[PDB]
Amino acid sequence: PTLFPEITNTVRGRFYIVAGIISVVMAVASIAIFWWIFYTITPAPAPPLQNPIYVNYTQEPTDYISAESLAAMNAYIQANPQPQAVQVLKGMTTAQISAYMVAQVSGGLKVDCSYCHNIANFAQQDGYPNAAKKVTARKMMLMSADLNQNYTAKLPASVGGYQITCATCHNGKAAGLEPYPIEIMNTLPNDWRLPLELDYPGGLVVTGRKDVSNHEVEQNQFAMYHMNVSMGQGCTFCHNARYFPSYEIAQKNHSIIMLQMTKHIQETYVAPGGRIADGIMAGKSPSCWLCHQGANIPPGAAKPGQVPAVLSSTP
């Protein structure tokens, strides 16, 4: 009793049905087994870090600090509540000051307290071979305070209350900090650097100028791609691609403040009247990748209200 004698009675036609069934079953089984294996052997999500004082940076792993160096810390802290010699930290008790050097300044550099000043007497200045590093540390701290109080304050509160600190630039390395690594120089010439010689409210404008050509546009494109790599959000983060000179997206102004701050850093601290002398930072010019490192907010940036009041954006 069939309406397909040519399909249900012939041996060849009778094998069509079984072949199709087996093919469908095997395809489904293959897909299911592969995806089950992938989802069963794949690792768990890479979680974030939740330090109360940092964004995406941790100082908690603590073995750079000597087990004996902590003892002289407590011995000095018990000895005197008030700081004997403070020039920048004029408004903190020795308890808070010690809790701040253990947490932030040494955590951002990942160095022992012997790296700066002498364990036998913390407040002595010029009685050991490592005093120049302490002077450089004070100058670095003053620079951080200046940067907080002049450029980060101008940014709106919607961005956040994040403030610059020691771990923002150094990122856990005392010395050997390198802006412009080989990783971020992918499609650019390896000698290229950010052009900190220009006036940034109108420095890189190229649209409809008639006095420039593809050379200037190439330089502008190099700078723009560096900005793209430093943030990791692509070219549409600060621009409306239908008209580049437009001011709509509201991160094109924050970028202006960043450009002015970077130019100020290069002109005041990196090479003030010559990098060879009268200059901290060892002549290493800054870049957007130095702090940001591929994220909108720098991983080492401190949450609002954590740095000392003298160094905060609002003192």
């Binding site: 249900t8 009778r14 049905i17 079984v18 069934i21």
Partner: peptide, 26 residues
């Protein structure tokens, strides 16, 4: 009851396909 209902439906599918295939190929 996610596994039990799936098992019941799959068993029904297998038994029905066995029955119909036996009907056709005989």
């Amino acid at each position: 009851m996610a596994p039990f209902l799936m098992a019941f439906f799959t068993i029904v599918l297998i038994v029905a396909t066995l029955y119909f295939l036996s009907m056709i190929m005989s």
